[PDB]
Amino acid sequence: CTLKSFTVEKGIYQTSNFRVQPTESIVRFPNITNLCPFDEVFNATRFASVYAWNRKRISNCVADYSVLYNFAPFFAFKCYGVSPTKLNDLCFTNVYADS
Amino acid sequence: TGTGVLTESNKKFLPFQQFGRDIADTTDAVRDPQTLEILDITPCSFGGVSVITPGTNTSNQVAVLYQGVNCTEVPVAIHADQLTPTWRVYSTGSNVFQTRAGCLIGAEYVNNSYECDIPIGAGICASYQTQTKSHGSASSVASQSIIAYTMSLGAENSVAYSNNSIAIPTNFTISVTTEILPVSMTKTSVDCTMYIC
Amino acid sequence: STPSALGKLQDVVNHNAQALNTLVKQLSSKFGAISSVLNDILSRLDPPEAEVQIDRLITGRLQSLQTYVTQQLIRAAEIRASANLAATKMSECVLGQSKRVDFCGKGYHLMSFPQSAPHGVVFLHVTYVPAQEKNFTTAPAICHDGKAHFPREGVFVSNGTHWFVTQRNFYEPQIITTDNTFVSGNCDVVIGIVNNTVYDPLQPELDS
Amino acid sequence: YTMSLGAENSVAYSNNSIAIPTNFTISVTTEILPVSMTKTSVDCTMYICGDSTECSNLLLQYGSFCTQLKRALTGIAVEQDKNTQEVFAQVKQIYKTPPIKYFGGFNFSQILPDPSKPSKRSPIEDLLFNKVTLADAGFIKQYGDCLGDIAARDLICAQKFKGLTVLPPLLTDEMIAQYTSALLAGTITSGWTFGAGPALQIPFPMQMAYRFNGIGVTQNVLYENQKLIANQFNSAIGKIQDSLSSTPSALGKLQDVVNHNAQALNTLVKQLSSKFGAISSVLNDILSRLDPPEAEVQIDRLITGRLQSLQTYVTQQLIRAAEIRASANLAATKMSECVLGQSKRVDFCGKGYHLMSFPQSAPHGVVFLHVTYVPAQEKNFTTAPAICHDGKAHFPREGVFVSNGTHWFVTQRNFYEPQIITTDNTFVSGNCDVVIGIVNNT
Ligand SMILES: *[C@@H]1O[C@H](CO)[C@@H](O)[C@H](O)[C@H]1NC(C)=O
Ligand SMILES: *[C@@H]1O[C@H](CO)[C@@H](O)[C@H](O)[C@H]1NC(C)=O
Ligand SMILES: *[C@@H]1O[C@H](CO)[C@@H](O)[C@H](O)[C@H]1NC(C)=O
Ligand SMILES: *[C@@H]1O[C@H](CO)[C@@H](O)[C@H](O)[C@H]1NC(C)=O
Ligand SMILES: *[C@@H]1O[C@H](CO)[C@@H](O)[C@H](O)[C@H]1NC(C)=O
Ligand SMILES: *[C@@H]1O[C@H](CO)[C@@H](O)[C@H](O)[C@H]1NC(C)=O
Ligand SMILES: *[C@@H]1O[C@H](CO)[C@@H](O)[C@H](O)[C@H]1NC(C)=O
Ligand SMILES: *[C@@H]1O[C@H](CO)[C@@H](O)[C@H](O)[C@H]1NC(C)=O
């Protein structure tokens, strides 16, 4: 097929390239702990008033949305502009966990 | 990101330096990000494939050379499955020879040395040698008849040098060799508009 | 019988043909254009819109033609190197005898005959190639009367009992006289010097 | 300053002034001929496209440029093997040097193979190997890609990473070295007779007498001062070693060839980082950022840029390969006429009258040790164009008429050795009338 013939002759012919595909996936990030305050806010001694909603600065830390679950069942988890579970794959200049 | 083999590194990464780079801007060395170890990134084993064959009218058996890779650790995965021994996980037996050029699969190594017919690479030369070692059919040996061998650079003559010995040729042949010199390729004219437009 | 005897000229012809065929296939390559036919491009999109596509096709075809012309220049430089080689081979091998080693065929070139072939020349390099060599004992000089003799034209060999000066490229022994050897120095410095006898052609005329 | 064109010598021309050299030197010069650049293969998909499937699909739509480029590179590579075969494999048989390596004093030990070191290369070959920057040899290190190391000189590893593949020479460095050994053994033992067919043994003093006779120098000189020739040869070889090791400009030609190859490859690699007007220069990032429907334009532009870079690389490789092939035809000619024989073309096998030549394999080339004869210490004499005797003009058969000041001698034209003038070195043609400047003598 390479020689476009049916009577190929004696010799060595470069046909293709030998490749070895990878077989595993290794995704690793350097073990950052940097606990964002989410649980400590939600069970504080006293919250802030709704009209005077406290602007909690959520930055310089790593988010752990997996703990947003295991709260009271059928709690509203609406999200506007982005899915709640995909937030792990998104980065933000700032986050506000206004409560 | 990268594709390759992560191996343990003997090189100590600076307290703040991130990941090794070579002279030509390549992600070669590395330090484990999660924990304080160091690794090296090795390119995957990909080389090439070449087909060594005699005349098709002479044979339908074949040999396959993988250039660069080494027979010992080469990940020869399932390339193509058919009745032929090549492109499988392993060959049918001892016909897997390791040379500097690469891995020759389907051809049997020979300790004897003949003249080079099909250069494989790194001094090893192949040949479809019809032999009675299998003691089978004359025109078709039992296995694949493709063999590899060290290229006999010629008859290892020993010019009998002596401080007094000389040789004078008694006879001669008026040889008529034939040298073909291309002189004038077919002169060509390309009407630019006619071709391009 | 052997199809590779005319390998070079047939290869040149095939190179020409394959360059032409590559040029032809360039009219089939899209080069990123929406198609590879000028008429289809013109008939599908209006010139204000087809201008980009036709310019892309023109650039592709023009670059392919430029590559063709440049590789023609390169292989024409190769052809001209071989052509000055052929002119020199005609001048020194055909129009004369060349003493350049292995220039007009392996062995000592005798003469050459031009034979025109399609887009080239075939030189039947009639060369002289020795064979059936005989071994002898040699010596770099010959000591006679206490002074050295060196061969004018040949080389000293010996079948075992007699020393002969022979032509250096065809075994033809000859006796040694003053007409084939010349005196230079004496027999104290030269290594490998051997005692022998060197004949004087004038001797018989001394009878009277 | 204004360029000094040299010592403004005043050639003391006269109607009868001549200079005949009384002394000479055996100049072992050195000519370095590149023979075969490193053969290379460019996996079009792996270089231009890497591992990206969409890029390969688009490249196939573009045409058969990859096929033409691969065929051109394969032609270059088989041409490099052909260059080695034409330059080196000039003989069928392989000749082993005799164990008694005595040749009248010509110490070939630094050019003959070294049985002590395992490489068996000559010490001069070892110097040439060390001075030139090395190259990959596909060492079996179980690294997946033959040779490799951890945080070290991985530029070859990087080149194999990028898809450019340096295929090994067909004749290994040891096998190329053994072919060079065969050539040098035939030259030392057979002489010039092994290039015309069968190899015919001849001692080295006799071959050197032939070399003397082939440059218009009578061969007796080689034997009357054989020890002087041997000592000059050996000391010149030592000076060759010293100059090659000390002066870094000695191996300039081959080192520049290797550097040209390396910088061509480095420019190729940097083309991968060049943008050519694309949003970036990494195919994987382009694909992961933009889907193929919108990344198509950017990847097409990058493909065109890298294809142009590869095509320019291949064309300049063809140009420099034609240069290497011209130098390789020159090297084959120099082996045929200087090594396999004696070339009387002036300044072809080194400045001065070329005596003989020795091939020494160096990385991707050959060092010719052009042993030439160079005169020196000339003496001035009054000369004549002919010699009148008995009313007829005698002319020299082979030499030249010079005069001490009171005696006339016919001497060889390139080495002062006075000889009486007789009928054997001179012949009669005409009368003493049309010969202006004719000189009475006996
Ligand atoms: C040549 O013969 C032997 C062996 O090669 C060597 O050792 C010796 O020096 C030489 N003798 C003569 C007379 O040339
Ligand atoms: C020389 O060789 C030829 C073979 O080509 C042979 O026919 C001829 O008889 C030989 N000459 C002599 C004198 O033996
Ligand atoms: C050779 O001849 C010289 C005189 O011509 C004589 O003295 C000498 O003994 C002879 N033999 C050798 C080996 O020189
Ligand atoms: C050597 O040549 C001479 C020359 O006539 C001859 O008489 C003698 O028999 C030859 N001997 C041998 C051994 O060839
Ligand atoms: C010699 O000297 C010069 C140069 O040839 C010339 O002018 C002069 O006439 C010559 N005389 C004779 C006798 O050659
Ligand atoms: C010829 O030149 C060499 C230079 O190496 C010198 O050693 C030698 O003495 C010179 N010959 C004479 C006779 O002075
Ligand atoms: C040279 O010889 C001739 C005779 O052949 C004689 O006539 C003449 O005087 C001599 N001297 C010169 C300077 O010609
Ligand atoms: C020139 O050489 C001869 C040779 O015997 C000698 O007689 C004469 O004295 C020398 N003259 C000069 C000036 O060198």
Residue numbers in the entry:
A (entry chain B): 301 to 399
B (entry chain B): 547 to 743
C (entry chain B): 940 to 1147
D (entry chain C): 695 to 1136
What text comes from the article?
To do this, we performed cryo-EM structure analysis of O5C2 in complex with the S protein of BQ.1. The resulting cryo-EM map revealed the asymmetric binding mode of O5C2 to the 3 RBDs of the S protein. One of the 3 RBDs exhibited a well-defined cryo-EM density corresponding to the Fab of O5C2; another RBD exhibited slightly less resolved cryo-EM density; and the final RBD showed limited and fragmented cryo-EM density that precluded further model building of the Fab. Compared with the RBM, the structural epitope of O5C2 on the RBD of BQ.1 covered an area of 1,019 Å2, which was much larger than the RBM of BQ.1 (876 Å2). Importantly, the ACE2 binding interface was completely covered within the O5C2 epitope. This exceptionally large epitope encompasses 35 residues, whereas the average epitope size of the 19 class I antibodies included in the structural comparison was 21.5 ± 6.5 residues. Although the O5C2 epitope included some variations among the Omicron variants, namely D405N (present only in BA.2 and BQ.1), F486P (present only in BQ.1), and Q493R (present only in BA.1 and BA.2), these mutations are located on the periphery of the epitope and could be tolerated by O5C2 according to the BLI competition assay.
The entry of the virus into host cells is facilitated by the S protein, which forms transmembrane homotrimers protruding from the viral surface.
